[PDB]
């Protein structure tokens with residue numbers, strides 16, 4: 111699905127060593143710009159072992 115593609119692309123992104131050295135807020139804005147919902151972003155951060163609350167992600171994006 112296009113959803114799973116979005117989340118998979120986010121995971122690959124978040125795993126990058128440079129990206130790991132980038133702040134969460136930056137990453138979150140970036141992912142929204144690529145069309146991901148807050149929920150999809152939250153999924154991705156948990157999948158990579160850097161879990162964030164949906165609440166924190168929505169706050170970044172608010």
Ligand SMILES: COc1ccc(CN2CCc3c(c(C(=O)NCc4ccccc4)nn3CCO)C2)c2ccccc12
Nearest residue numbers: 116119120122123124126128129132136137140141144
């Ligand atoms: C917000 O921080 C960044 C954004 C983009 C970049 C540039 N790329 C970083 C590595 C990268 C990117 C992308 C990427 O833009 N993929 C497209 C995509 C599509 C939908 C959701 C997420 C990513 N994927 N990867 C991993 C495999 O190359 C984008 C950054 C690079 C270093 C540090 C921070 C970056």
